[PDB]
């Protein structure tokens, strides 16, 4: 182990933040060296401004703004769509592990039995829910927009304080790198997230029944045997 | 000497060696010959990989027919890509 | 042809070891750095539990699968989590006579990293420090073992 | 209670994040400095929003009061047909054409293509004359005119007015979200939006939103 | 999170009118600014509500507790006769005294007037000498004594005693408000609150408040 040589501003880590990045299309990249706004210094900018829906750089910060913490949600609501139809498949009872009517087991017996266990939360009412989550989510995304306790608001994007259990947040070049396996798998989750959604709309199964009925007959059991349905007529 | 500091990039990774590895070899994977009536080394046992993920939690049986199809096809998997790794011309042929 | 991997340590060919992708690659190398064996930070204590933790929860296992008492329901955990905490006991007795026979005299002179720099002296190795990563190994460790038979009792479909 | 200022009432309040953006601070009614994606960045940009959502907050507030009030004047003393917003466009196919006021002594509107062809010429108009003025005085502001276009006279005094603008600039806002509720209800339920009032009123909370939660299940 | 200031949470948050009436502003646990009446406009007598205050949440507190454990421990795995707050009052009348625990091993009370007697000499001597002080060390302090109440030693670092002060009214304020929920539930259904909890999570919308809304009906 070294001490990556910082000293600089830079960022190459193998070759990721500088005038030659990794671009999108292997031979045509953006013309004219990338458009002149953006040229490296910050995670994600690969050079896809061809509709151009930000040239003004409060624009490019406020998008940022957005991209981290739709990302970050986008991460949790891919695993959180993955885990309880792979767990209700090996031996877990849980009502429907499928996750449409997910929310609608508060209607079925008794309310939300969780893990099939019937010593649990139990949550009947779905106003109190409703309450909790404007209340807390409300407080914690004022929290977010300006800094309270727990740590004080410094960087929007990246607080980086005694949130961190781990402490990692030291050396700037290994995060040079980590702040990009961030968007990178965030932009993933964004894509599964778009195939949960439209499998959602097209056929309504699970997406790990999907991907069973898929591999159960690869060639027969695709996207183009829904090609039929939702035609007019 | 052999070199004064270990070089962090020593898989000089060239991005099309592994899509032309497994594309390139996977593509003339699926022919159909006589040898089995009609059927390829690739979609021959992707009846087989969704045969026994149908019933999911029972490992597959210990004489059936299709891990030859596995080791088989790796053999040659892991071959067309070390070989495509020595693509790298850039000094040397 | 001008392209070479495997490199002495450090420039320095007269050290007896050579560098190869195996002990100097990058992924490597970060990762045994953020072992906790290796942080040189923290007090001995907490690596003494963390590393406890670990090690008592794996040993628990193999004395319940393979033990005498594995075919007799309801009772083959408690026998195997049992024989488990004596191990670990043991362990804690090794770790302890070890600091009374190790750092019992002087230590070495001095010590740089990798990348050249004088970094300090580990605090684990002297006698305090290493008493206490004891200690904290027997807490971690017996803890781990007791959380092995509370992880066998309630876990989904264990088997 | 100091909205052209520094001390407005911000977006969060006491959670306000006191670092406003720099491009707008005061001066105008209804700046609530709540710009998460910032589409308004650009100051004549900026301005076309301000008079898009102007006419957008007019048009609105004009539309949900014609959405309470017929609806409500039929089930007192008076009979439309079809008083619920959804079938009063289709009055003029069903039997005798539009009657207005439920009455055959009104407009009796038979054929639509007739309110079609007027409509688009006096929409047109109205419209072009909106943006580059004419009648009643050149139009020299178009944000405001300030022409004969109140024949009261309110305009008189500045903070009165200002405040005023700030009401226009509130009640279009909350029309705006408002029509976007009749336009769900118009979606989900279906039903009329006065009779939702009214089986609300009766069911606090037996029938409150979610069994109307089953009806758009893929399948 | 900054009650220690003038950024405390104020009794509206977001709408929290910075104009706060300036003989309160921080420096006390609990002074969240809402005077409405002011009726501790006086220095010497906000003193008075301060030490009042405290000594209702701390008594509130007790009983607020002293009314959820007995009822819940009689469920569980135990007897006491009437675990319900009404009639343990009257369990001294009814058969064989007060026995505690619901066991004739325990405190096996069988006169009420001695209890009433002991009990007075008793109160009359703790709330003596908590108003002037006396036994293990003389009061110097009327709100927060610091003697040898703290077996444990909590007291040491500030801030952390602070917020210990302000977690402490709060509290408080929870146990009065709960207390005075408990009394209304005695008033109107006299039942077990706990009860009432078992049958309101048993039945969440079909008997709520309103089925004990037609019984006070004058006529
Ligand atoms: C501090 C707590 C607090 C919470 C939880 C909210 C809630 C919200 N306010 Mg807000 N407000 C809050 C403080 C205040 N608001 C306002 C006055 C307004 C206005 C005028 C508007 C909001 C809007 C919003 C929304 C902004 C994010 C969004 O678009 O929703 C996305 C999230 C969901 C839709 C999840 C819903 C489930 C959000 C639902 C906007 C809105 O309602 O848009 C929908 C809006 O126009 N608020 C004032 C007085 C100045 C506040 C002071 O406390
Ligand atoms: C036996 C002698 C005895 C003496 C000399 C004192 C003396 C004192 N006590 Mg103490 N107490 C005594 C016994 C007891 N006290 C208390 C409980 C308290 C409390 C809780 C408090 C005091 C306080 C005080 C001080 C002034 C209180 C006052 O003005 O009363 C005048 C009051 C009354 C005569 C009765 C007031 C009843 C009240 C209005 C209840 C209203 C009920 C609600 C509206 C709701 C009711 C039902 C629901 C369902 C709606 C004073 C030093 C107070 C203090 O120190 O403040 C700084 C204080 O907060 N005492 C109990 C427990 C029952 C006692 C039992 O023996
Ligand atoms: C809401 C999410 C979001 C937001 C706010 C942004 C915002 C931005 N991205 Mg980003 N991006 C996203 C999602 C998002 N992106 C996803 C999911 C990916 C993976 C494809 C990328 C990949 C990406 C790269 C590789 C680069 C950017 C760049 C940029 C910046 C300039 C580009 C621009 O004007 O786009 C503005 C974006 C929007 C206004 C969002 C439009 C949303 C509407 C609904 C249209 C989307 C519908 C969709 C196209 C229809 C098909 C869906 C199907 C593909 C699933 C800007 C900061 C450039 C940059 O500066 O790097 C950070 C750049 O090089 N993005
Ligand atoms: C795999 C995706 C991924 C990656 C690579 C990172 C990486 C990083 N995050 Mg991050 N983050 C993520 C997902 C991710 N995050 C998600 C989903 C959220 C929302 C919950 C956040 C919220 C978040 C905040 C609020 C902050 C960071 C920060 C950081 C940086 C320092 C922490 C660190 O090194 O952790 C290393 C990360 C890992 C080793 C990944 C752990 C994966 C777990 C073990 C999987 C199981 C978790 C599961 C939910 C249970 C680093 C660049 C901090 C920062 O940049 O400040 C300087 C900071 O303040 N992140
Ligand atoms: C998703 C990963 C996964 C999981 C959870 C299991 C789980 C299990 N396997 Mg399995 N297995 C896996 C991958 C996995 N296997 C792979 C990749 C192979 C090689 C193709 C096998 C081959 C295999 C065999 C040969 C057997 C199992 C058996 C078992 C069971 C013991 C248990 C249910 C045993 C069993 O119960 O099958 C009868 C058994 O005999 N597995
Ligand atoms: C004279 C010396 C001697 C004695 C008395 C024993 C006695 C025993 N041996 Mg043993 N052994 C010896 C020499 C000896 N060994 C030598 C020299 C070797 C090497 C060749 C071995 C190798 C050996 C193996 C490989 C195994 C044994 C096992 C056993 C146990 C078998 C009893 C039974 O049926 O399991 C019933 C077992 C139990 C009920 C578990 C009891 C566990 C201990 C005794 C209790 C510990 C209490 C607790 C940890 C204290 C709490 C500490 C606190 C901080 C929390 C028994 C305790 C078996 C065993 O225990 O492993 C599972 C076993 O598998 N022996
Ligand atoms: C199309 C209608 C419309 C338009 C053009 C505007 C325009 C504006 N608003 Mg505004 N607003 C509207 C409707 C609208 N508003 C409604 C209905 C509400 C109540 C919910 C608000 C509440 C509001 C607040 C609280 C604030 C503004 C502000 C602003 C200004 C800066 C933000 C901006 O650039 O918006 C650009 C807007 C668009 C480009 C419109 C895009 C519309 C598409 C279809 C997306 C909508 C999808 C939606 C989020 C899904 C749910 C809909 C449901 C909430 C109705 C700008 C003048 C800020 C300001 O400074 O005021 C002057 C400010 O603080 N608005
Ligand atoms: C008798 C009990 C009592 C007393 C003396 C006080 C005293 C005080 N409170 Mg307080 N409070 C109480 C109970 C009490 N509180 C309860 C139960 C709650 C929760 C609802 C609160 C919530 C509260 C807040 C949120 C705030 C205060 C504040 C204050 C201070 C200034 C207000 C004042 O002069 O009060 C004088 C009070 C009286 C003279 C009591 C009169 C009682 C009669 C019987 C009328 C009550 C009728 C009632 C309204 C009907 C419904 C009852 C139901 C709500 C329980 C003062 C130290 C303010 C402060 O700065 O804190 C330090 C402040 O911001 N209180
Ligand atoms: C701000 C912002 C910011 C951030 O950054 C981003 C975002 C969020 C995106 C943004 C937002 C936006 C929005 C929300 C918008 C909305 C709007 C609306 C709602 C409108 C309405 C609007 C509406 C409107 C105009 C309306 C109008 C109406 C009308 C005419 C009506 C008519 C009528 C009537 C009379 C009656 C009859 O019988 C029928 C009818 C036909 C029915
Ligand atoms: C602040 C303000 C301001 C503005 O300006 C004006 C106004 C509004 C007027 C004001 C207000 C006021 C108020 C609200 C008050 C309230 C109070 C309360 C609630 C108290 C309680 C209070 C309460 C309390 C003490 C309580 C106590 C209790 C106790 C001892 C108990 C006992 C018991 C127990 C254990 C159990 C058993 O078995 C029985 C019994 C016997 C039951």
Not at chain 1, 52 to 58: I, R, V
Not at chain 2, 72 to 87: D, N
Not at chain 3, 37 to 44: E, F, S, W
Not at chain 3, 114 to 132: K, M, Q
Request: hydrophobic share 45%.
């Amino acid at each position: 182990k070294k001490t990556a040589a910082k000293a600089a501003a830079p960022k190459s880590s193998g070759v990721e933040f500088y005038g030659p990045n990794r671009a999108k299309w292997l031979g045509p990249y953006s013309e004219n060296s990338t458009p002149a706004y953006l040229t490296g210094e910050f995670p994600g900018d690969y050079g896809w401004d061809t509709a151009g829906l930000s040239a003004d750089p409060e624009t490019f910060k406020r998008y940022r703004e957005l991209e981290l913490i739709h990302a970050r949600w986008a991460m949790l609501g891919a695993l959180g769509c993955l885990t309880p139809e792979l767990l209700a498949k090996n031996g877990t009872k849980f009502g429907e592990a499928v996750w449409f009517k997910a929310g609608a087991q508060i209607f079925s017996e008794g309310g939300l039995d969780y893990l099939g266990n019937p010593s649990l939360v139990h949550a009947q009412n779905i106003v109190a829910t409703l309450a909790v989550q404007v209340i807390l989510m409300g407080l914690i995304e004022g929290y977010r927009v300006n800094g309270g306790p727990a740590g004080e608001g410094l960087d929007p994007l990246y607080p980086g304080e005694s949130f961190d259990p781990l402490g990692l947040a030291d050396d700037p070049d290994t995060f040079a790198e980590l702040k990009v396996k961030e968007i990178k798998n965030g932009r993933l989750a964004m894509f599964s997230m778009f195939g949960f959604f439209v499998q959602a709309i097209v056929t309504g199964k699970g997406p790990v029944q999907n991907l069973d009925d898929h591999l159960a007959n690869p060639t027969v059991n695709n996207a183009f045997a829904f090609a039929t349905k939702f035609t007019p007529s | 000497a052999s070199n004064k500091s270990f070089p962090r990039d020593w898989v000089k990774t060239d991005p099309l060696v592994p899509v032309l590895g497994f594309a390139g070899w996977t593509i003339p994977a699926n022919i159909g010959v006589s040898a089995f009536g009609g059927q390829s080394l690739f979609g021959l046992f992707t009846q087989s990989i969704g045969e026994n993920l149908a019933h999911f939690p029972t490992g597959p049986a210990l004489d059936d027919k299709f891990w030859l199809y596995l080791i088989t096809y790796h053999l040659g998997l892991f071959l067309t890509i070390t070989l495509g790794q020595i693509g790298v011309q850039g000094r040397k042929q | 042809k001008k392209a070479q991997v495997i490199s002495p340590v450090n420039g320095d060919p007269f050290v007896g070891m050579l560098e190869t992708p195996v002990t100097s690659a990058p992924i490597v190398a970060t990762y045994l750095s953020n072992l906790p064996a290796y942080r040189t930070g923290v007090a001995p204590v907490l690596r003494g539990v963390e590393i406890g933790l670990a090690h008592g929860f794996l040993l628990a296992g193999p004395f319940i699968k393979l033990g005498p008492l594995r075919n007799v329901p309801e009772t083959a955990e408690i026998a195997g989590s049992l024989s488990a905490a004596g191990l670990v006991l043991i362990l804690a007795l090794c770790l302890s006579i070890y600091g009374s026979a190790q750092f019992q005299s002087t230590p070495s002179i001095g010590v740089k990293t990798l990348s050249g720099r004088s970094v300090a002296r580990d605090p684990l190795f002297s006698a305090d420090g290493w008493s206490e990563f004891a200690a904290g190994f027997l807490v971690g460790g017996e803890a781990g073992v007791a959380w092995a038979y509370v992880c066998t009792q309630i876990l989904p479909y264990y088997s």
